[model samples]
Target: KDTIYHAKDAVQATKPDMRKPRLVVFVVGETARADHVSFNGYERDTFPQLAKIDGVTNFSNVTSCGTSTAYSVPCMFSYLGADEYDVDTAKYQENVLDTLDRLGVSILWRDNNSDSKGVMDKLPKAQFADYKSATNNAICNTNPYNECRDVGMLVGLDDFVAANNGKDMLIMLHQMGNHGPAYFKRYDEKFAKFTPVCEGNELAKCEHQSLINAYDNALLATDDFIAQSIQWLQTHSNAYDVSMLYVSDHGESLGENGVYLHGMPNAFAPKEQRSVPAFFWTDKQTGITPMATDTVLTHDAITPTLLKLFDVTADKVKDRTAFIRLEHHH
Candidate 1:
């Protein structure tokens, strides 16, 4: 039997010139609208926790490659940009993760939303943790969707870091942040900073203000989840060149012109359904210069940045620009 893989045979990797024990946390957010995040000048202060932290640069003009998770997740991970992506070919091709593995980076994917959309299929089962259909979570709603809270993925992260001492790693954490029409359930009561939220999934039946409140509250939870995750990485700052990259898969709509949710064709999708919130957080030692907020970023920048992080080069990555730029290593 011949083993089949793409990037394993296609990529060329060189050892990074930086220090050992580099760690990158890639947080893939769900249904987060760029306009609603406080970092983008949202009125409600939805991201108070991230605002207090240093070295966190909020990219204000990032756009998604697709309008939905099914298409966007894999698209973001692929080397192809939105203009050139085709699902038929993508399903058969290897993504950046595969190339990273070939480069000898230890990678882990912990997903709280639906699966990684075949993006993590190339990795070993041990490297992929599925929380979308899991039943053992303590603080999750498991009756219908079996969706665990995003915080569940961070449970054993400390041990994971400790166990893999001296190895370069890339950990992917996928969130179910503000996925509608059940926005009220995405967060705990502690994050329910907004009042009178829409209690049920029927967005059309709920009062418009209540629905907005629910959506904004869910964003609050996402902010807290990311902030806490960064704090966890900060604990190991001395051991590794720690960094976190947060980017939403796609944006959502809250009754804008009677458009209840996302998934409009890209040709006519409203800005709320396409513009997503993206940010990068790094320890000072990581030597990554914060990308200017005015830069027009897109999902295409993600994989190239991942490749640059490990000093891996592949012919598939035609685009050379990365969302964040690394300072020249001494």
Candidate 2:
């Protein structure tokens, strides 16, 4: 006879009911290296706003699965093992969107990068015009210029939360952050905290310091955008539990190993190009305390941790012990 298991008997059962909806904002930065940001102890105050946020867990030694966006983006979102994701395989397929949708959670993707990858194809396409017009395409693509200013993306968040009030939501913000050789274009003049800004995007013509300055400015702007997004969540959706996770798709090389951009073969990838930043900012209302552990973690652990935090069933969640330990203990 066939047997049936209820929620109680299920393996890796769901987490306790927090008795509230959840708003998870996953911010994916493009070509951002951990060593350059202030949060990771960079000399410059590149992340001043993010540094001041309370209950922020900064993963100082985080690494990406792949060295380039093409592999990193899909690998992080796929169900592949941390090690296996790097190696292209037939089994390593599907993504978090499919898993989350299967669990009955709502998803919204906001893009500020090249449309070739990330969650652009997974979610409804949305343009980056005005905030109002952009908001209307929460699940649909309405704007042609998807890679708008980071501030513009922040403005769109307000509309998303307003429209999906009282519901659990997963919002992805894929930023064009520090994506060289166009680092100068990532931020405006007001956020030019670094001196001697690199006005050009040419790797060969621009000096190393100039590019670094522009990249630092972009980080400062990103920190501001994140601060604004967190404030919006608290002010608008006080009833829902809000958590913000910041990670980079992959890191960039600035005259390191003689490579300027990403997409380099893994064998020759430098430490600066492989190491990326990962952090979580939780609102006090969530009843979750920020805990820091020395346990090394990777992007593969994100989905399962999120599922558990949202109180969703975890039977189907990937068996990533490192990720689960962080989510459960912290």
Candidate 3:
């Protein structure tokens, strides 16, 4: 009785108003806190690369669906809102990916964090790239973490785009962003701008500033990865109407009040644990308006926002409207 499907069988991609192919890159970040990101006015310059890009909207006031990945990842893709989402029942339902697939959009899920928590499972196995293996690619090293680096997700992207020529494409890049307590391992040495970082997973043994340094370093790497992705899309502008949206699954706690990690109950969770960084980007030809800076958003907006990005009607999703509005061309 709990299973409810939001996508109609009639769900289909409307004919594009323009001749260029459409491409949307959605990045799902893990354990990235809003206040810590420079885009949100943090003292550290954690977003140096993204700051240089034009027309990128920073949704600084966004909150996540849950405080942990297990709950937040699946819930962010579900039709349910934060208040209505149940982790157990969410898995049984078809998500936004499945809905868009029905509309003939080519969807790819490139996971660098723990595999998508089964959200994109219904899609063909060929469409999903599990970067969890140490040997999957040469770019990913096995020393620090058991999985590949976030940049590794971009390896086969060009090939995928070439294969699906002239088709509307959606690529989801699942980031291993700022995951702690070994945040130092998340980034490369050059990004270790904040020195004396907590080197080991043991948070209690390190000083507080060291922990923050490690976490901030990780953000720098994430910032670079995203910037790289945007630049790559820009090069394809001649062939595709490129757009990108990035939102974290949840925020992390960095040794605040002795809380070193996440997963606290939402009601009493610290603001640091609930606030997350979100960003959206599109080429000039996309005809979409960015969400206002004053608007406060939640994970509820993601599913609908993605629908609108792909030129599908947000109303089909039933509950939430796209935070980013589409412009009408006369």
Candidate 4:
């Protein structure tokens, strides 16, 4: 009950009286490698939406704590390093969402990816299946992967904003960004820019080029989703001071020494499996100014970084390592 009790204290914490309404949309991507991202100088222009944005900070080499949904997702939002992370302890601990909710931040988890693996269990959360947007049903097929298109998460965004009328909110969008061997299914045909996309589940069976083609296509789909997210934030600028932060839960390997997917031997996972992408972009007027940087951040920094964003000055979180402090240009 300590977790819940602490949660209660967090809930009762004093909220900052802001000069303007604030909003933070934390976009969580799955298995997106930093090495392959355009923002990090990948040969493919994988993050074009983010590229053209005026105020953007790209953290060149960020690292994931684990290599799977069950490991990295919760760890990213928790103050746990890989060496110290205990799954049992994690399951029972009060993570970032509970703390954010306690701090009077209106919290919601919208998923085009699967459920948040219990990271947002104590707070309000929803899935694409729950909303069932008509636009995504065909393009986003439900298969052995159980994935949905990221576009579905934005279907009723206006309604969501309306419901959150008076609150300074933190909305988390969980995306199945590049979920594995079925990468061919993650995007529509138009995104099949890289030809001969891999269709087989056994990635090892497919040619390496085909596997890469599929993965890059999935990356393009992620770019489209992020681009759309930025537009949505811009659309709602009149009401809320908004900014977006995206960080992937983990990375994946494509036929690297015969390892196609993540979650193999942790000690021997390739650099591609642990290095992921992270970035922040804002609406310019939000009193939030991120430094232009190429800092190498890790999963453990996420919670602290978010706490910094909202300026939650809790003594308990004071020692956490926040990635970067955003000072206002005002």
Q: TM-scores of all models?
A: 0.91, 0.81, 0.94, 0.88
Which residue pairs show collisions in model 4?
10-102, 11-102
lDDT of 1 at 149: 85
* Positional deviation of residue 167's Cα in model 2 after best superposition, in angstroms: 2.0
List ranges where model 4 is wrong by over 4 Å. 1-18, 124-147, 326-328
Q: List the residue pairs that clash in candidate 3.
A: none
Off by over 4 Å in 2: 1-18, 86-92, 116-147, 291-293, 315-318, 321-330
lDDT of 3 at 134: 57
Q: List the candidate 1 regions with Cα displacement exceeding 4 Å.
A: 1-18, 133-136, 141-147, 326-330
Tens digits of per-residue lDDT for model 2, 1-330: 221111221232332243577888887778888898776778888778877777677788778877876677766665554565543441224456655644555677666665435433444454222222345334223223343565566655667667766667777777777787777767766787778977775776887788788888888877887887777666644677888888898888888656787877778778778888877777876766544534577776676666655655544344564333434333
Of candidate 4, the 10-residue stretch with the lowest lDDT total is 4-13
Global CA lDDT of candidate 3, please? 0.83
Candidates' RMSD to native = 2.9, 5.8, 2.2, 3.2
Per-candidate Cα lDDT values, in order, are: 0.82, 0.66, 0.83, 0.74
Off by over 4 Å in 3: 1-3, 16-18, 142-147, 314-321
Best by TM-score: 3
